[PDB]
Amino acid sequence: MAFPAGFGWAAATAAYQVEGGWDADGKGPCVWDTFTHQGGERVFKNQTGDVACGSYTLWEEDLKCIKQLGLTHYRFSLSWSRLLPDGTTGFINQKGIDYYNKIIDDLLKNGVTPIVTLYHFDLPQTLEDQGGWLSEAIIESFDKYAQFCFSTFGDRVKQWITINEANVLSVMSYDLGMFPPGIPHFGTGGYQAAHNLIKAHARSWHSYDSLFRKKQKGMVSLSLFAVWLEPADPNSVSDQEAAKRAITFHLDLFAKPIFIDGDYPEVVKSQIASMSQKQGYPSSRLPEFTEEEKKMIKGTADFFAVQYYTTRLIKYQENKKGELGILQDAEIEFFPDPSWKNVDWIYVVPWGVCKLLKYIKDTYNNPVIYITENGFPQSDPAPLDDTQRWEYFRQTFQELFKAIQLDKVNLQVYCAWSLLDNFEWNQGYSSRFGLFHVDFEDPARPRVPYTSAKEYAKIIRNNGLE
Numbered sequence: 001m002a003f004p005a006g007f008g009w010a011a012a013t014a015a016y017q018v019e020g021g022w023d024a025d026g027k028g029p030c031v032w033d034t035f036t037h038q039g040g041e042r043v044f045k046n047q048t049g050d051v052a053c054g055s056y057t058l059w060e061e062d063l064k065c066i067k068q069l070g071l072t073h074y075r076f077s078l079s080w081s082r083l084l085p086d087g088t089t090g091f092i093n094q095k096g097i098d099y100y101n102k103i104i105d106d107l108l109k110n111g112v113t114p115i116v117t118l119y120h121f122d123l124p125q126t127l128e129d130q131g132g133w134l135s136e137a138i139i140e141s142f143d144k145y146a147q148f149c150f151s152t153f154g155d156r157v158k159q160w161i162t163i164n165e166a167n168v169l170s171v172m173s174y175d176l177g178m179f180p181p182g183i184p185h186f187g188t189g190g191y192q193a194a195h196n197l198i199k200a201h202a203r204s205w206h207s208y209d210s211l212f213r214k215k216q217k218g219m220v221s222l223s224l225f226a227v228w229l230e231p232a233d234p235n236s237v238s239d240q241e242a243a244k245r246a247i248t249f250h251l252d253l254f255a256k257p258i259f260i261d262g263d264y265p266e267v268v269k270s271q272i273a274s275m276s277q278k279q280g281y282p283s284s285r286l287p288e289f290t291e292e293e294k295k296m297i298k299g300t301a302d303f304f305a306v307q308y309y310t311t312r313l314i315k316y317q318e319n320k321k322g323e324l325g326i327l328q329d330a331e332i333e334f335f336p337d338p339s340w341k342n343v344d345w346i347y348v349v350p351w352g353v354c355k356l357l358k359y360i361k362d363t364y365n366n367p368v369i370y371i372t373e374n375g376f377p378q379s380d381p382a383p384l385d386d387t388q389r390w391e392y393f394r395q396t397f398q399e400l401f402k403a404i405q406l407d408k409v410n411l412q413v414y415c416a417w418s419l420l421d422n423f424e425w426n427q428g429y430s431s432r433f434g435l436f437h438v439d440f441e442d443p444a445r446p447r448v449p450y451t452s453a454k455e456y457a458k459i460i461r462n463n464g465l466e
């Protein structure tokens with residue numbers, strides 16, 4: 001199975017998950033600093049990213065790993081609070097700039113293309129205190145941060161992800177309150193955050209387009225988490241419709257406005273409006289874009305960035321009681337097929353990626369696609385010779401090949417999550433996604449390849465599979 005000549009083989013990290021140095025060199029606190037320090041068993045064993053992989057200190061070690069793999073591209077994020085301790089350009093942390101410039105310069109001198117995420121679940125605490133994604137002020141704050149990043153790094157960086165998984169962030173941080181700042185707002189907070197995330201993204205795209213694109217000649221997108229979804233009963237019309245509606249709710253809610261026409265899906269608007277009215281709201285819980293906002297948001301992504309891990313079965317579930325929540329708005333329930341293997345929520349369904357890629361091609365006018373994350377965790381602790389996990393990768397690669405060859409999907413880059421075992425949010429260090437093992441009990445945080453790292457390097461070297 002020979003991939004296209006020039007196919008991009010990458011791995012990914014995120015600043016809070018790998019960097020440590022949480023207060024090093026004047027870095028301001030981010031919401032995860034606050035969140036993990038509060039404890040209360042919200043994170044596995046009250047763990048924190050105070051040190052994590054120590055990548056702020058040990059970049060040279062990460063570079064060794066990247067070179068060993070022979071990556072063509074490397075995805076990492078910029079820490080907003082590291083660069084701008086208060087979230088604004090009134091005060092710049094030069095050691096923050098130097099750090100990221102060293103990553104970028106080292107990548108380029110080694111022929112590796114940076115793919116840079118501006119914002120990866122890690123708002124400066126100052127900005128969260130000012131309302132976070134629940135307040136309009138965030139839009140200008142984000143746009144100004146984006147411009148600062150484009151200005152500082154965009155002479156070398158040509159591929160940008162503005163916001164990591166705005167869909168997951170909306171839900172986790174602002175609806176369920178499982179992520180900082182860690183307050184439940186079932187059926188309300190998610191949509192409000194989503195609205196501002198979409199506007200902020202679009203604003204940053206326009207800033208790029210107007211101020212930076214002519215000279216820098218790069219491209220800008222935002223990454224979206226996608227779970228492939230199938231009807232629980234394939235012969236059920238209600239389950240068929242429910243699975244499509246669930247895709248529409250979690251993925252197209254963001255992608256339709258940005259890629260298509262600047263507005264939410266009609267089924268999303270109608271479902272939430274109907275529920276909201278029954279619940280006694282004078283207005284829908286889904287905010288409305290003005291016509292000018294629709295015009296501004298439409299066409300603000302240069303490629304489709306998708307992050308795929310797993311698949312679910314979907315059953316229609318009528319909201320008979322008019323309960324308040326996103327699942328209730330969508331009138332669905334999700335569950336796995338009993339036959340699928342899993343570690344935590346990651347059920348191994350490689351064919352899901354093929355169905356997803358074809359869906360993106362069919363729905364979003366055959367765009368350039370980057371898979372900016374895909375991978376598999378092992379439970380801690382976690383054999384170095386991870387032959388079982390490698391099989392999951394192999395199967396996934398075969399499905400990527402199918403998507404390209406049979407379905408003519410324009411997949412240009414595949415990014416493995418992760419480079420390193422890292423701080424897996426609420427799972428802490430108990431979930432190990434790395435191609436490289438990290439010993440978090442060792443103050444030097446040594447990196448050692450899993451078998452998957454050796455096998456992935458072979459795939460890259462051959463540009464494909466046997």
Ligand SMILES: CCCCCCCC/C=C\CCCCCCCC(=O)O
Binds near residue numbers: 250310330
């Ligand atoms: C990882 C499997 C997620 C499947 C969600 C598919 C349904 C899409 C439509 C509704 C979005 C609501 C999301 C609620 C997710 C709960 C996540 C959690 O408890 O950690």
Ligand SMILES: CCCCCCCCCCCCCCCC(=O)O
Binds near residue numbers: 249
């Ligand atoms: C604004 C509402 C739209 C609904 C968007 C739903 C997006 C899917 C939610 C699933 C969250 C799964 C999080 C996995 C945890 C992790 O990333 O470490």
Ligand SMILES: CCCCCCCCCCCCCCCC(=O)O
Binds near residue numbers: 324
């Ligand atoms: C001054 C405060 C104004 C707030 C007015 C309340 C607006 C209605 C929101 C209530 C949500 C819960 C409704 C009950 C659920 C149901 O009947 O199905």
Ligand SMILES: OC[C@H]1O[C@@H](O)[C@H](O)[C@@H](O)[C@@H]1O
Binds near residue numbers: 014168307373417424
């Ligand atoms: O859970 C594995 C990964 O999944 C994605 O939803 C997120 O972008 C990563 O930050 C996370 O570590």
